[PDB]
Enzyme design. Structure first.
Site, PDB file in Angstrom:
ATOM      1  N   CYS A   1      -2.981  -2.115  -1.170  1.00 48.06           N
ATOM      2  CA  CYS A   1      -1.588  -2.028  -0.751  1.00 48.06           C
ATOM      3  C   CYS A   1      -1.346  -2.642   0.643  1.00 48.06           C
ATOM      4  O   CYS A   1      -1.851  -2.133   1.659  1.00 48.06           O
ATOM      5  CB  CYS A   1      -1.070  -0.585  -0.801  1.00 48.06           C
ATOM      6  SG  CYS A   1       0.667  -0.479  -0.247  1.00 48.06           S
TER       7      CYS A   1
ATOM      8  N   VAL B   1       2.653   4.849  -1.149  1.00 46.32           N
ATOM      9  CA  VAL B   1       1.715   4.767  -0.019  1.00 46.32           C
ATOM     10  C   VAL B   1       2.240   3.712   0.950  1.00 46.32           C
ATOM     11  O   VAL B   1       2.959   2.796   0.536  1.00 46.32           O
ATOM     12  CB  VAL B   1       0.289   4.388  -0.472  1.00 46.32           C
ATOM     13  CG1 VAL B   1      -0.383   5.563  -1.181  1.00 46.32           C
ATOM     14  CG2 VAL B   1       0.318   3.145  -1.360  1.00 46.32           C
TER      15      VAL B   1
ATOM     16  N   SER C   1       5.625   2.922   5.866  1.00 45.07           N
ATOM     17  CA  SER C   1       4.599   2.305   6.688  1.00 45.07           C
ATOM     18  C   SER C   1       5.022   2.100   8.143  1.00 45.07           C
ATOM     19  O   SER C   1       4.273   2.458   9.059  1.00 45.07           O
ATOM     20  CB  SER C   1       4.158   0.982   6.067  1.00 45.07           C
ATOM     21  OG  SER C   1       5.209   0.038   6.075  1.00 45.07           O
TER      22      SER C   1
HETATM   23  N1  LIG Z   1       8.882   0.807   2.255  1.00 44.72           N
HETATM   24  C1  LIG Z   1       7.572   1.397   1.958  1.00 44.72           C
HETATM   25  C2  LIG Z   1       6.999   0.702   0.730  1.00 44.72           C
HETATM   26  C3  LIG Z   1       5.567   0.951   0.380  1.00 44.72           C
HETATM   27  C4  LIG Z   1       5.168   0.567  -1.023  1.00 44.72           C
HETATM   28  O1  LIG Z   1       5.856  -0.180  -1.711  1.00 44.72           O
HETATM   29  N2  LIG Z   1       3.954   1.080  -1.583  1.00 44.72           N
HETATM   30  C5  LIG Z   1       3.635   0.690  -2.960  1.00 44.72           C
HETATM   31  C6  LIG Z   1       2.255   0.139  -3.022  1.00 44.72           C
HETATM   32  S1  LIG Z   1       1.984  -1.511  -2.486  1.00 44.72           S
HETATM   33  C7  LIG Z   1       3.712   1.934  -3.819  1.00 44.72           C
HETATM   34  O2  LIG Z   1       3.234   2.978  -3.390  1.00 44.72           O
HETATM   35  N3  LIG Z   1       4.326   1.877  -5.128  1.00 44.72           N
HETATM   36  C8  LIG Z   1       4.391   3.081  -5.958  1.00 44.72           C
HETATM   37  C9  LIG Z   1       4.414   2.862  -7.418  1.00 44.72           C
HETATM   38  O3  LIG Z   1       3.455   2.261  -7.974  1.00 44.72           O
HETATM   39  O4  LIG Z   1       5.383   3.286  -8.095  1.00 44.72           O
HETATM   40  C10 LIG Z   1       6.619   1.319   3.146  1.00 44.72           C
HETATM   41  O5  LIG Z   1       6.784   0.384   4.006  1.00 44.72           O
HETATM   42  O6  LIG Z   1       5.683   2.184   3.313  1.00 44.72           O
END
Ligand SMILES: N[C@@H](CCC(=O)N[C@@H](CS)C(=O)NCC(=O)O)C(=O)O
Ligand SMILES: [K+]
Ligand SMILES: [K+]
Ligand SMILES: [K+]
Length: 242
Positions: free
Chosen positions: A30, A70, A84
């Site tokens: 990630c 995450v 993040s």
């Molecule tokens: N805006 C968030 C976005 C983080 C994000 O998109 N994490 C992805 C992984 S790359 C996730 O956990 N997706 C959850 C899923 O598979 O539904 C941040 O900056 O922390």
């Protein structure tokens, strides 16, 4: 001291008890979670990593990370931060050594602008990865505008890194996409013309040598393998490094 590659936990996996160490809910590939790792590395904050299978999420995740995403950090039992950039700004406020954000509010703002400037890059990468057929030339052009803008900021500042002679918030918060650009470097829509982008290509080489970056690097053949699953619509293998 830290193991970046403990098993990714799935539904049915037990939640490890809090033990005092600042803990990151992560997944190894990630890029968003990588922001939190970089920050923690650069600042030399002791922490532990709990990896999360994002296809088959642990039942207790939303308990730690409300949007089921995450990264999330747990700073005390049942006290967590997620998003993040939110996590990184918290660590910078609470751990004063190796400040990532400029103290001067104007410089701080510029850094955040720079980070926003990488959205088109974040966008192209995720499109090429998961919706590759829909990738058009506005995306590719926007991405280049993105690179142009960032390179120019570096050019104007005249330093090794956006934040000075050491990488800072702006550098670390955009870095994950540059790490990934390296594996897309033989897709024609991503490869960087070395005259136009020689300064940016040089900056990327220097970043690879920063210890916050290097200790967490994904070997490129592994990253390409991982990405492969997506382009085939396969189920991800989160354990390539384990
Ligand atoms: N805006 C968030 C976005 C983080 C994000 O998109 N994490 C992805 C992984 S790359 C996730 O956990 N997706 C959850 C899923 O598979 O539904 C941040 O900056 O922390
Ligand atoms: K992503
Ligand atoms: K995403
Ligand atoms: K491959």
């Amino acid at each position: 001291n830290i193991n970046f590659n403990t098993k990714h936990l799935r539904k049915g996996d037990p939640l490890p008890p809090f033990n005092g160490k600042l803990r990151v809910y992560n997944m190894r590939y990630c890029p968003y979670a990588q922001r939190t790792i970089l920050a923690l590395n650069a600042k030399q904050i002791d922490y532990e990593v709990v990896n999360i299978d994002l296809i088959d999420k642990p039942e207790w995740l939303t308990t730690k990370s409300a949007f089921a995403k995450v990264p999330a950090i747990e700073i005390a039992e049942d006290v967590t931060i997620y998003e993040s950039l939110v996590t990184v700004e918290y660590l910078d406020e609470v751990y004063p050594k190796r400040p990532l954000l400029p103290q001067d509010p104007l410089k701080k703002a510029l850094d955040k602008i720079i980070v926003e400037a990488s959205a088109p890059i974040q966008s192209l990468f995720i499109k090429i990865l998961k919706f590759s057929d829909t990738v058009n030339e506005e995306h590719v052009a926007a991405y280049h505008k993105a690179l142009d803008f960032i390179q120019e900021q570096l050019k104007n500042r005249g330093t090794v890194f956006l934040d000075g002679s050491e990488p800072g918030y702006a550098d670390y918060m955009i870095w994950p996409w540059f790490e990934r650009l390296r594996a897309f470097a033989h897709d024609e829509r991503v490869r960087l013309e070395p005259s136009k982008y020689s300064l940016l290509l040089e900056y990327i080489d220097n970043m690879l040598k920063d210890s916050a970056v290097s200790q967490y690097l994904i070997p490129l053949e592994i990253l390409a393998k991982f990405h492969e699953a997506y382009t085939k619509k396969e189920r991800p293998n989160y354990e390539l490094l384990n």
